[PDB]
Amino acid sequence: SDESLAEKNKNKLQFIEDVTTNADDVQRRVLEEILSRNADVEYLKRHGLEGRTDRETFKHIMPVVTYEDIQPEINRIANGDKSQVLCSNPISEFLTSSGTSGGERKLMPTIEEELDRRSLLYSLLMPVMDQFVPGLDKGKGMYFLFIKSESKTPGGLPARPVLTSYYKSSHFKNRPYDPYTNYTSPNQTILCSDSYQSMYSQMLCGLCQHKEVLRVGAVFASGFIRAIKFLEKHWPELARDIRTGTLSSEITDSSVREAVGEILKPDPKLADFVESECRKTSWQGIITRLWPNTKYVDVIVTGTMSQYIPTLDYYSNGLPLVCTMYASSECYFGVNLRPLCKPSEVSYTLIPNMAYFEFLPVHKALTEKEQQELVDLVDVKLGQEYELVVTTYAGLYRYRVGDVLSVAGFKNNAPQFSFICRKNVVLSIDSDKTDEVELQNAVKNAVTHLVPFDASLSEYTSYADTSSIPGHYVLFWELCLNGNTPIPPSVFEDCCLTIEESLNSVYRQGRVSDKSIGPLEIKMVESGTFDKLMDYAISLGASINQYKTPRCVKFAPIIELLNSRVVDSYFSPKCPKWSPGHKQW
Numbered sequence: 001s002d003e004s005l006a007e008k009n010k011n012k013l014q015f016i017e018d019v020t021t022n023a024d025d026v027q028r029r030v031l032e033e034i035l036s037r038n039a040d041v042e043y044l045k046r047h048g049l050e051g052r053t054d055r056e057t058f059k060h061i062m063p064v065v066t067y068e069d070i071q072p073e074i075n076r077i078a079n080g081d082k083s084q085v086l087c088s089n090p091i092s093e094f095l096t097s098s099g100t101s102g103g104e105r106k107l108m109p110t111i112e113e114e115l116d117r118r119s120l121l122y123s124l125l126m127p128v129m130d131q132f133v134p135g136l137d138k139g140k141g142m143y144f145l146f147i148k149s150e151s152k153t154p155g156g157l158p159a160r161p162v163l164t165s166y167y168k169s170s171h172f173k174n175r176p177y178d179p180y181t182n183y184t185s186p187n188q189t190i191l192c193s194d195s196y197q198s199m200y201s202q203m204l205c206g207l208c209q210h211k212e213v214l215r216v217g218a219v220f221a222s223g224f225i226r227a228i229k230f231l232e233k234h235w236p237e238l239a240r241d242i243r244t245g246t247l248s249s250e251i252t253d254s255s256v257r258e259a260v261g262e263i264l265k266p267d268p269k270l271a272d273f274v275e276s277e278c279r280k281t282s283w284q285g286i287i288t289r290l291w292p293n294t295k296y297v298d299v300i301v302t303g304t305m306s307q308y309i310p311t312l313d314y315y316s317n318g319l320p321l322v323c324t325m326y327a328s329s330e331c332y333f334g335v336n337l338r339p340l341c342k343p344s345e346v347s348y349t350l351i352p353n354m355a356y357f358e359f360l361p362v363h364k365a366l367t368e369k370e371q372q373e374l375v376d377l378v379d380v381k382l383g384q385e386y387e388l389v390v391t392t393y394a395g396l397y398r399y400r401v402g403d404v405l406s407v408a409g410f411k412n413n414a415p416q417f418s419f420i421c422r423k424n425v426v427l428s429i430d431s432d433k434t435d436e437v438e439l440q441n442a443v444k445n446a447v448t449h450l451v452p453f454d455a456s457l458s459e460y461t462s463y464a465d466t467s468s469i470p471g472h473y474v475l476f477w478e479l480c481l482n483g484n485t486p487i488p489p490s491v492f493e494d495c496c497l498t499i500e501e502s503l504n505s506v507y508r509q510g511r512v513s514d515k516s517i518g519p520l521e522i523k524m525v526e527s528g529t530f531d532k533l534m535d536y537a538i539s540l541g542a543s544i545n546q547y548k549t550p551r552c553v554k555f556a557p558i559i560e561l562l563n564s565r566v567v568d569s570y571f572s573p574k575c576p577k578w579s580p581g582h583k584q585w
């Protein structure tokens with residue numbers, strides 16, 4: 001009903017006003033519920049909280065923690081401990097974060113109830129968008145949504161990414177008919193374990209219903225960029241399926257075949273049109289040509305994903321890029337209340353019902369005083385930067401997420417945050433988040449191949465190259481040759497693979513499982529290249545004694561400068577090794 005939908009939207013927006021006005025009280029209430037329900041859990045009992053639920057005591061008693069501090073408890077639960085270790089409710093599963101510890105995905109505990117809070121955040125997005133872009137209930141959204149690799153812990157609990165867990169839950173699979181969540185992709189195309197068949201069926205379903213499409217997207221920019229690349233490679237096969245009304249024999253999954261069968265009909269004119277647009281040399285504006293009623297591209301382009309803004313603007317011909325929410329495996333955080341703002345102006349308003357949020361000022365061990373005086377959600381100051389600290393319903397207490405956020409403004413009393421970065425992350429193409437330490441150790445393993453040739457790496461840096469789809473990590477190497485035997489290309493290709501083999505499981509899964517990352521490249525640079533970069537820094541006030549070559553570079557003019565001094569480049573000849581789950585298991 002049009003009246004019931006408008007009433008529902010108005011109530012969700014009034015909920016936002018209520019919780020942003022009474023933000024500190026909602027925060028107080030959330031922490032009280034977490035601490036009363038889990039009063040008798042081992043973690044809080046051993047720290048002496050003694051069933052006290054007040055905020056003042058919690059901040060004085062409980063320590064601020066990293067994943068490594070609580071890994072003993074997490075591993076015990078993963079090995080089968082069903083007692084109340086971190087939570088009074090049973091841990092339903094582990095949500096495997098893209099952030100890693102010891103090169104393995106961090107295991108974030110969750111409880112069945114947490115899906116109600118994830119569904120609450122998702123329920124606020126269309127009521128917010130509807131204010132700015134009306135009429136979205138009269139069409140469909142073409143979203144490319146994917147389930148990723150799953151595994152089981154030794155104790156039998158599922159270990160899977162938060163999005164795979166949500167799509168497989170009844171909150172998404174058995175969701176009620178909402179015209180605002182009417183997607184072109186049937187649930188069976190999303191819930192398909194074969195990534196190729198999932199992408200192929202979703203792209204075909206998207207093309208079959210192209211006139212009904214009012215918005216396009218994916219969770220992340222990289223994933224949507226890959227869907228466009230998939231169409232670049234398979235549009236002749238896909239147009240054939242439209243013309244004949246028969247799905248490709250490569251789609252062997254019977255559940256996908258039945259779901260696609262209820263949409264796919266023979267349509268030679270649509271096939272001719274799809275062929276005519278894709279045949280064109282320039283794909284600038286292919287999204288608006290194939291899906292002409294698209295109002296915006298809905299992908300996250302904040303954080304590392306901002307490197308994709310030029311590619312997305314090319315394929316969309318400058319349609320608005322919309323960043324709707326900020327979330328993690330450990331906790332869903334906030335929504336963007338200005339979805340039509342410019343990507344550089346995006347701020348996320350944290351919803352105080354999700355978790356009890358705390359803020360560590362930034363300008364790593366924390367002093368007793370610093371842990372005690374962590375800033376509450378409503379007390380953060382405009383323009384100041386903070387690390388996000390979270391206390392969740394699923395057994396995390398004063399957990400450092402590692403995200404650095406800046407205060408852009410306030411919605412009533414609730415702060416709005418610009419996303420700065422995930423601390424220490426230097427390279428990323430899709431979900432992979434390679435930190436400076438993983439990279440340094442991967443390069444240290446690779447330079448052992450140069451030792452028999454009496455060669456050494458004088459200096460190196462890196463950047464994430466998005467000139468190709470899927471993107472790849474690029475390493476710039478400057479060698480010091482002290483021997484007489486020239487180094488053959490196979491040795492440098494062995495270095496490329498040795499780096500890849502030492503990178504974390506998310507990087508290696510990206511190369512092996514979903515093909516979201518391309519082969520790593522080592523670009524050799526002329527002698528004196530890194531001394532020329534040092535000359536740029538010395539001119540800008542850097543000392544010779546304090547200068548160290550950065551391990552990673554993002555600023556395009558410096559990447560261009562290094563690329564201009566390249567002699568030869570080498571690529572990894574094969575994928576690194578990868579299998580689902582932790583190597584220990």
Ligand SMILES: Nc1ncnc2c1ncn2[C@@H]1O[C@H](COP(=O)(O)O)[C@@H](O)[C@H]1O
Pocket residue numbers: 096097098099162300301302303304323325326327328329330401403419421422431
């Ligand atoms: N809207 C967003 N903009 C920028 N970074 C984001 C956004 N949403 C999630 N992230 C990052 O991804 C992390 C969660 O990764 P994961 O736990 O694998 O889902 C967050 O803590 C952020 O660092």
